[PDB]
């Protein structure tokens, strides 16, 4: 049955270390049982019985105090049978990552945090740690990944994020990661407010 | 009442491939997360890997990855573990166990265990016998001493002498080496006029030793 | 990746003494530590999960404590069924690692030896029984030799060993030397020589008639 469930993450897919995140499988299709599968360092499948509200079948899976094994690509399967466990098509993937495992990076704005409309803004992620890649986040829920430049004479590993001509303003944060552990990120950079006047 | 039964003990040569089974009862095989733990002679317990509950994919440990493949058959309600290249270090008792989980995606331990399966690499250790004369109704014989392992075959005059031959069962000495004696009851007048040679063969060490027993 | 260091490696204990086993983690594992018990031949048995939570059918004498990087397993009152090897295992991060193990072993007890001369009342009957008592020893393997004067005897001795005692896993042995009154009167020095693993040197208990 190629009817896929939907997978959400409350509060968000970026969960700090040793904190709890609620992964919700919901669908207009009536499902009596739900299966949550993770791909990563430690692959596991979780089951929760389905709850029925209005015409929506939903289950709030609980991913406990965040640790390395609980991070990865999550896909939710659906079922109405239990002993057969006839599995639906996989949900659209959701990458749950753990933050706060490394030192925070430094986020800077050139020309500056506050800028006039139409003026190009470029945000720079820098850290003395050897982060192989940096992640830019606006309002918490965002994903812009660029590879990082290596050891500068300054000793900083840096990546430049071109925001382009400025029409919107938001609160941007930076995260650092290593290529070996893709779903394990660093502490958030000190938030940088981009304002367009 | 979840229960796990395992395959029988296996003796394999170096470089061979061994496969152990783990049959589950008392619940749905899909709900179980079955892991495999190794207990080496000197080493303690080592988690080699385990199958994911429903889908059957297996998480592995880096040390055992590349030589260990963990599979599952939902029809037989049985889990399998295969070692690719057998070495003397692999000789150990291998267990299968069900890992139980609580809230939050955590697992808290292995509550149910199998009975364990003994895999053993080839020993390849032999020691040749030393044959000494039991010098001379009269009695002559040969003392086959300090050999490992059993068996040893003793003949007299290349098998031409069978009358009066008693080849005793072997005994395990304090040294851990075996020793036996073969004796022949002989007419006394024949001692200076008859030839008595004991032919000892130890095929494990491919050593063949012949000794003529001379009266003193 | 997480290394578990377990101490001690071995405990020489008798029945009834408190035994404490510690398990230190290379990094913080929270409360996600399990204690196992493996008796010889059989498979490991889970005793405690979540550092402190005991499984069903586990006696209350087993107690688990600790959090973060330091953990302890305390058996308040040891019993004969509690002599085994104990392991700690972390369940926090995928490379689930066990401790090296703590072997709780029964303490080797040297035998207390006593020699008993024949009674005067028994001597009136014409037979003489010399008794050698080995009391409270482990392991159960011991050599009791009867040496009248300095000559060893063979066919004049019988032995009896007690079943293992629960309060102290200690066997007791009695060797009885039966001789005739005339044979008993011919020789003067009667000795019982005992060799046991717990005894540093073979112990001789002897008496001379008189
Ligand atoms: C799941 O959690 C969200 C946020 O806590 C809540 O609004 C929602 O009602 C929950 N759904 C169910 C089925 O419990
Ligand atoms: C991450 O931030 C926390 C404070 O929220 C801090 O205690 C911790 O030391 C930081 N991690 C590193 C690696 O500096």
Author numbering:
A (entry chain K): 25 to 221
B (entry chain H): 1 to 136, 145 to 224
C (entry chain L): 1 to 210
Paper quotes:
The killer immunoglobulin receptor (KIR) family, which recognizes HLA class Ⅰa, is another group of inhibitory receptors on NK cells. The KIR family consists of single-pass transmembrane receptors, including inhibitory receptors with long intracellular ITIM domains (designated as “L”) and activating receptors with short intracellular domains (designated as “S”). Among the inhibitory KIRs, KIR2DL1 recognizes the HLA-C2 group, while KIR2DL2 and KIR2DL3 recognize the HLA-C1 group17 classified based on polymorphisms at the 77th and 80th amino acids.
Since an antibody that selectively distinguishes KIR2DL2 and KIR2DS2 has rarely been reported and binds to KIR2DS2, we performed phage display to develop a selective anti-inhibitory KIR antibody. Unlike HLA-C or Pan2D, KIR2DL2/3 agonist 61 Fab bound only to domain 1. The epitopes of each antibody determined from the crystal structures were highlighted in the sequence alignment of inhibitory and activating KIRs. The KIR2DL2 fragments containing the epitope of KIR2DL2/3 agonist 61 were protected from heavy hydrogen exchange. Meanwhile, some amino acid differences from KIR2DL2 to KIR2DS1/2/4 that could cause steric hindrance or loss of hydrogen bonds may impair the binding of KIR2DL2/3 agonist 61 to KIR2DS1/2/4. Epitope analysis by X-ray crystallography and homology modeling confirmed the high selectivity of KIR2DL2/3 agonist 61.
